[PDB]
Amino acid sequence: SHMASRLLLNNGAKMPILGLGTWKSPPGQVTEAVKVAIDVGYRHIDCAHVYQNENEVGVAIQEKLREQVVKREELFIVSKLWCTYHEKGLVKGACQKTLSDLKLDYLDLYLIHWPTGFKPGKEFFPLDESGNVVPSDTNILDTWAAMEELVDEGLVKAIGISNFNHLQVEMILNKPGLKYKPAVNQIECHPYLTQEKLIQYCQSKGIVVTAYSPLGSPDRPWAKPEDPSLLEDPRIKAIAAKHNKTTAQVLIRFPMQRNLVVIPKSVTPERIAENFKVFDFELSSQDMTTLLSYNRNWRVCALLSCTSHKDYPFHEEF
Ligand SMILES: NC(=O)c1ccc[n+]([C@@H]2O[C@H](COP(=O)([O-])OP(=O)(O)OC[C@H]3O[C@@H](n4cnc5c(N)ncnc54)[C@H](OP(=O)(O)O)[C@@H]3O)[C@@H](O)[C@H]2O)c1
Numbered sequence: 001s002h003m004a005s006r007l008l009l010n011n012g013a014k015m016p017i018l019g020l021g022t023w024k025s026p027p028g029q030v031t032e033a034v035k036v037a038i039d040v041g042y043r044h045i046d047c048a049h050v051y052q053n054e055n056e057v058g059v060a061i062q063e064k065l066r067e068q069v070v071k072r073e074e075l076f077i078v079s080k081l082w083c084t085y086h087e088k089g090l091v092k093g094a095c096q097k098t099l100s101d102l103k104l105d106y107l108d109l110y111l112i113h114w115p116t117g118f119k120p121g122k123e124f125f126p127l128d129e130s131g132n133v134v135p136s137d138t139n140i141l142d143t144w145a146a147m148e149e150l151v152d153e154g155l156v157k158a159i160g161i162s163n164f165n166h167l168q169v170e171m172i173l174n175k176p177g178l179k180y181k182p183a184v185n186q187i188e189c190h191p192y193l194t195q196e197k198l199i200q201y202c203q204s205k206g207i208v209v210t211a212y213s214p215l216g217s218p219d220r221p222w223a224k225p226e227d228p229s230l231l232e233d234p235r236i237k238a239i240a241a242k243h244n245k246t247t248a249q250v251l252i253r254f255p256m257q258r259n260l261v262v263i264p265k266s267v268t269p270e271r272i273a274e275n276f277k278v279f280d281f282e283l284s285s286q287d288m289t290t291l292l293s294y295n296r297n298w299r300v301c302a303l304l305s306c307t308s309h310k311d312y313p314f315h316e317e318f
């Protein structure tokens with residue numbers, strides 16, 4: 001289908017363009033979900049400390065390594081530094097905690113989960129008595145230096161960012177004494193949020209973009225009835241039907257043809273397999289442009305708690 005399975009990052013490593021997402025995958029189901037994914041061909045898993053299921057994901061990876069279904073070098077494991085760990089002195093420990101839970105001795109990619117730093121502590125979202133999230137005074141350039149140390153200590157092969165707008169990406173690229181550029185910016189992207197500008201900017205700098213919530217995150221906990229629904233969009237279903245594929249398969253193939261990495265989440269064995277079977281057809285340039293035309297600047301993940309945080313990413317146009 002004129003589609004290679006991996007693309008080149010600016011650290012010299014290759015990254016599988018299809019990965020399994022794990023946000024919201026319940027701890028009692030994610031182990032089998034990851035086993036099934038690897039069994040059917042996935043080599044890239046997207047994780048995060050904040051998803052609270054890294055231990056269970058790790059059980060799956062470890063078993064598949066033990067069974068010799070796959071070698072570690074063939075796996076591409078991604079995790080993310082949570083906001084309460086931006087303080088320089090906490091970054092390594094957060095990384096090591098994720099490594100211990102995932103049962104790995106290194107990550108292929110470690111991302112700053114959000115540009116917004118929070119006060120350190122047990123709570124993922126520390127609040128003042130009025131309900132506001134309490135920020136940290138750490139700035140993202142120092143956090144980036146801490147991330148660079150992880151590469152130099154061998155804990156991760158690549159470092160990157162997530163939910164950074166183009167000015168924030170630019171701030172890193174212009175950092176005095178920058179040692180390693182971000183390899184990846186992982187951002188929300190689907191036909192209702194097409195991200196033409198941010199994607200063009202990142203790619204122009206050699207930063208690879210990963211598209212999250214490619215199916216529109218129907219299981220997002222804050223979903224409402226008025227919300228659009230990609231999987232129910234007759235226009236998208238029509239394109240699927242024309243190709244004898246499912247609507248989800250079209251939604252996953254879409255970012256692949258824009259040179260994006262994409263990470264659909266499922267804990268359903270049947271859908272896990274379906275979501276991987278997207279290398280056997282090609283959307284036309286017309287299909288692509290039609291899908292792009294559906295942009296609404298509609299976000300699943302707007303982090304509405306933190307609009308007042310100085311580093312909140314989504315006030316900027318991109
Ligand atoms: N960096 C960030 O801040 C950030 C933010 C959001 C997401 N992400 C990453 O991106 C991943 C994917 O995003 P997401 O979890 O928000 O949502 P998503 O992948 O767009 O959609 C997941 C939902 O779609 C369902 N689904 C999966 N395959 C399907 C299919 N073939 N047909 C019908 N329904 C299907 C899943 O149900 P079942 O699981 O029940 O099958 C689940 O409810 C996340 O898991 C996470 O790893 C990162």
Ligand SMILES: CSc1ccc(/C=C2/C(C)=C(CC(=O)O)c3cc(F)ccc32)cc1
Pocket residue numbers: 023048050051052125300301302303304305
């Ligand atoms: C402090 S009240 C609040 C504020 C923000 C959010 C938003 C969240 C979003 C967008 C995500 C997905 C992601 O960032 O990957 C998330 C994952 C988690 F484990 C926990 C919370 C959140 C949820 C609740």
